[PDB]
Amino acid sequence: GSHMSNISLIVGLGNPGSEYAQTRHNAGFWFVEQLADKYGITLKNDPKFHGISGRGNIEGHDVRLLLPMTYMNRSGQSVVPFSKFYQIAPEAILIAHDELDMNPGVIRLKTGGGHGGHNGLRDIVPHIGPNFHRLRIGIGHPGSKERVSGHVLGKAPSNEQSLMDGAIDHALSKVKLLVQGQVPQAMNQINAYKPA
Protein backbone atom coordinates (compact mmCIF):
# COMPACT_ATOMS: atom_id res chain seq x y z
CA GLY A 1 0.00 0.00 0.00
CA SER A 2 1.22 3.49 0.73
CA HIS A 3 4.10 4.24 3.11
CA MET A 4 3.93 7.11 5.50
CA SER A 5 3.84 10.63 4.11
CA ASN A 6 5.70 9.73 0.95
CA ILE A 7 3.08 10.81 -1.64
CA SER A 8 2.08 7.65 -3.61
CA LEU A 9 -1.15 8.82 -5.31
CA ILE A 10 -1.55 12.11 -7.16
CA VAL A 11 -5.11 12.98 -8.20
CA GLY A 12 -6.08 15.77 -10.55
CA LEU A 13 -9.66 17.06 -10.41
CA GLY A 14 -11.61 18.21 -13.43
CA ASN A 15 -14.44 17.46 -15.82
CA PRO A 16 -14.16 15.15 -18.86
CA GLY A 17 -14.59 16.28 -22.47
CA SER A 18 -13.06 18.78 -24.83
CA GLU A 19 -15.60 21.44 -23.83
CA TYR A 20 -14.19 21.49 -20.27
CA ALA A 21 -10.52 20.83 -20.88
CA GLN A 22 -9.49 24.51 -20.98
CA THR A 23 -11.71 25.66 -18.13
CA ARG A 24 -10.42 26.83 -14.75
CA HIS A 25 -12.09 23.91 -12.94
CA ASN A 26 -9.70 21.60 -14.81
CA ALA A 27 -6.54 23.10 -13.23
CA GLY A 28 -5.88 19.81 -11.44
CA PHE A 29 -6.03 17.87 -14.70
CA TRP A 30 -3.52 20.33 -16.18
CA PHE A 31 -1.06 19.67 -13.38
CA VAL A 32 -1.36 15.88 -13.45
CA GLU A 33 -1.21 15.60 -17.25
CA GLN A 34 1.93 17.73 -17.28
CA LEU A 35 3.45 15.67 -14.45
CA ALA A 36 2.69 12.45 -16.31
CA ASP A 37 4.46 13.79 -19.44
CA LYS A 38 7.42 14.98 -17.40
CA TYR A 39 8.02 11.51 -15.91
CA GLY A 40 6.79 9.35 -18.77
CA ILE A 41 3.81 7.95 -16.91
CA THR A 42 1.13 6.65 -19.25
CA LEU A 43 -2.41 7.86 -18.46
CA LYS A 44 -4.75 5.20 -19.78
CA ASN A 45 -8.38 4.43 -19.52
CA ASP A 46 -9.38 2.95 -16.17
CA PRO A 47 -12.97 1.86 -16.43
CA LYS A 48 -12.94 -0.11 -13.16
CA PHE A 49 -12.30 3.14 -11.27
CA HIS A 50 -14.24 5.50 -13.51
CA GLY A 51 -11.15 7.42 -14.49
CA ILE A 52 -7.92 7.68 -16.39
CA SER A 53 -4.95 6.44 -14.39
CA GLY A 54 -1.30 5.55 -14.52
CA ARG A 55 1.58 4.20 -12.52
CA GLY A 56 5.28 4.81 -12.80
CA ASN A 57 8.53 5.84 -11.24
CA ILE A 58 8.94 9.38 -10.03
CA GLU A 59 12.46 9.97 -8.66
CA GLY A 60 12.80 6.38 -7.47
CA HIS A 61 9.31 6.06 -5.98
CA ASP A 62 6.29 4.08 -7.26
CA VAL A 63 3.51 6.62 -7.80
CA ARG A 64 -0.02 6.30 -9.13
CA LEU A 65 -1.81 9.11 -10.99
CA LEU A 66 -5.61 9.47 -11.27
CA LEU A 67 -7.96 11.74 -13.22
CA PRO A 68 -11.61 10.97 -12.29
CA MET A 69 -13.89 10.71 -15.38
CA THR A 70 -17.06 11.04 -13.27
CA TYR A 71 -17.66 14.78 -13.65
CA MET A 72 -16.34 16.98 -10.87
CA ASN A 73 -19.16 16.60 -8.32
CA ARG A 74 -18.88 12.81 -8.45
CA SER A 75 -15.06 12.66 -8.15
CA GLY A 76 -15.22 10.54 -4.99
CA GLN A 77 -16.80 7.77 -7.02
CA SER A 78 -13.32 7.35 -8.60
CA VAL A 79 -10.90 8.46 -5.87
CA VAL A 80 -12.41 6.50 -2.98
CA PRO A 81 -12.57 2.99 -4.51
CA PHE A 82 -9.17 3.53 -6.19
CA SER A 83 -7.51 4.42 -2.91
CA LYS A 84 -9.28 1.55 -1.09
CA PHE A 85 -8.30 -1.07 -3.67
CA TYR A 86 -4.62 -0.04 -3.72
CA GLN A 87 -4.59 0.47 0.09
CA ILE A 88 -3.40 4.08 -0.16
CA ALA A 89 -3.99 6.04 3.05
CA PRO A 90 -5.12 9.70 2.76
CA GLU A 91 -1.82 10.85 4.20
CA ALA A 92 -0.09 9.51 1.04
CA ILE A 93 -2.52 11.29 -1.35
CA LEU A 94 -2.02 14.63 -3.08
CA ILE A 95 -5.10 16.14 -4.75
CA ALA A 96 -4.47 18.97 -7.21
CA HIS A 97 -7.40 21.32 -7.68
CA ASP A 98 -8.45 24.80 -8.65
CA GLU A 99 -8.74 27.23 -5.72
CA LEU A 100 -11.15 30.16 -5.91
CA ASP A 101 -9.65 31.73 -2.71
CA MET A 102 -6.25 32.40 -4.35
CA ASN A 103 -5.10 34.56 -7.24
CA PRO A 104 -3.93 33.17 -10.58
CA GLY A 105 -0.19 32.57 -10.16
CA VAL A 106 -0.57 31.71 -6.47
CA ILE A 107 -0.11 28.06 -5.55
CA ARG A 108 -0.02 26.42 -2.14
CA LEU A 109 0.42 22.98 -0.64
CA LYS A 110 -2.03 22.37 2.24
CA THR A 111 -2.55 19.39 4.51
CA GLY A 112 -6.01 18.85 5.86
CA GLY A 113 -8.96 21.25 6.10
CA GLY A 114 -12.32 21.37 4.44
CA HIS A 115 -13.48 21.61 0.84
CA GLY A 116 -13.66 25.42 0.83
CA GLY A 117 -16.74 25.18 -1.37
CA HIS A 118 -15.06 23.04 -4.03
CA ASN A 119 -17.60 20.55 -5.41
CA GLY A 120 -15.01 17.89 -6.18
CA LEU A 121 -13.39 17.97 -2.77
CA ARG A 122 -16.92 17.95 -1.28
CA ASP A 123 -17.40 14.49 -2.86
CA ILE A 124 -14.13 13.14 -1.39
CA VAL A 125 -13.67 14.42 2.20
CA PRO A 126 -16.78 12.59 3.55
CA HIS A 127 -15.31 9.25 2.63
CA ILE A 128 -11.56 9.42 3.22
CA GLY A 129 -11.57 12.28 5.72
CA PRO A 130 -9.62 15.50 5.37
CA ASN A 131 -6.06 14.34 6.06
CA PHE A 132 -4.83 14.28 2.47
CA HIS A 133 -2.61 16.90 0.92
CA ARG A 134 -3.85 19.46 -1.60
CA LEU A 135 -2.12 21.41 -4.32
CA ARG A 136 -4.29 24.51 -4.36
CA ILE A 137 -3.91 26.12 -7.79
CA GLY A 138 -5.23 29.69 -7.60
CA ILE A 139 -7.80 30.57 -10.26
CA GLY A 140 -8.88 33.95 -8.86
CA HIS A 141 -11.95 35.21 -7.20
CA PRO A 142 -15.31 34.83 -9.03
CA GLY A 143 -16.90 38.09 -7.79
CA SER A 144 -20.45 37.32 -6.68
CA LYS A 145 -21.66 33.92 -5.32
CA GLU A 146 -23.81 34.06 -8.49
CA ARG A 147 -20.81 34.29 -10.81
CA VAL A 148 -19.10 31.13 -9.41
CA SER A 149 -20.17 28.50 -12.01
CA GLY A 150 -19.49 30.89 -14.86
CA HIS A 151 -16.04 31.59 -13.34
CA VAL A 152 -14.92 27.98 -12.80
CA LEU A 153 -16.40 26.77 -16.05
CA GLY A 154 -14.78 29.67 -17.94
CA LYS A 155 -11.60 29.71 -19.98
CA ALA A 156 -9.26 32.20 -18.31
CA PRO A 157 -7.90 35.20 -20.24
CA SER A 158 -4.35 34.77 -21.46
CA ASN A 159 -2.68 36.79 -18.72
CA GLU A 160 -4.34 34.71 -16.00
CA GLN A 161 -3.58 31.51 -17.91
CA SER A 162 0.08 32.47 -18.10
CA LEU A 163 0.19 33.10 -14.36
CA MET A 164 -1.42 29.70 -13.64
CA ASP A 165 0.86 27.93 -16.03
CA GLY A 166 3.96 29.35 -14.36
CA ALA A 167 2.72 28.32 -10.91
CA ILE A 168 1.96 24.80 -12.17
CA ASP A 169 5.41 24.58 -13.70
CA HIS A 170 6.95 25.55 -10.36
CA ALA A 171 4.96 22.89 -8.55
CA LEU A 172 6.06 20.22 -11.03
CA SER A 173 9.64 20.93 -10.00
CA LYS A 174 8.76 20.21 -6.34
CA VAL A 175 7.04 16.85 -6.81
CA LYS A 176 10.39 15.18 -6.13
CA LEU A 177 10.19 16.51 -2.53
CA LEU A 178 6.65 15.21 -2.11
CA VAL A 179 7.29 11.66 -3.32
CA GLN A 180 10.30 11.65 -0.95
CA GLY A 181 8.08 12.57 2.03
CA GLN A 182 9.61 16.05 2.43
CA VAL A 183 6.21 17.67 2.83
CA PRO A 184 7.37 20.56 5.06
CA GLN A 185 10.10 21.59 2.66
CA ALA A 186 7.75 21.20 -0.30
CA MET A 187 5.20 23.40 1.45
CA ASN A 188 7.79 26.09 2.07
CA GLN A 189 9.12 26.02 -1.47
CA ILE A 190 5.72 25.79 -3.25
CA ASN A 191 4.09 28.42 -1.09
CA ALA A 192 6.93 30.87 -1.64
CA TYR A 193 6.28 31.00 -5.42
CA LYS A 194 5.71 34.42 -6.94
CA PRO A 195 4.99 34.98 -10.70
CA ALA A 196 7.12 38.03 -11.19
| Choice from 24, 64, 134, 174 touching Cl ion (CB under 5 A) | 134
Q: Is 39 annotated in some ligand binding site?
A: no
Residue 57 labeled ligand binder:
no
Rounded to 10 degrees, the C-alpha dihedral 64/65/68/72 comes to 120
Nearest Cα neighbor of 7 from 86, 65, 63 is: 63
Q: Residue 15 CB, nearest distance to Cl ion (Å)? A: 6
Question: Within positions 147 to 176, which residues make up the interface with Cl ion, using CB under 5 A?
Answer: none
Site for Cl ion (CB under 5 A): which residue of 108, 133, 151, 174? 108
Between CA 48 and CA 5 the distance in angstroms is: 26
Question: What single-letter DSSP state applies at residue 60?
Answer: T
Check if 3 is active-site: no
Q: Are 13 and 29 in contact (CB under 8 A)?
A: yes
**Which position among 117, 131, 155, 173 is part of the footprint of Na ion (CB under 5 A)?**
155
Smallest distance, Å, CB 111 to Na ion?
A: 12
Question: 3-state DSSP call for residue 36?
Answer: helix
Task: Catalogue the active-site residues.
Answer: 25
Binding interface with Na ion (CB under 5 A): 24, 155-156, 182, 184-185
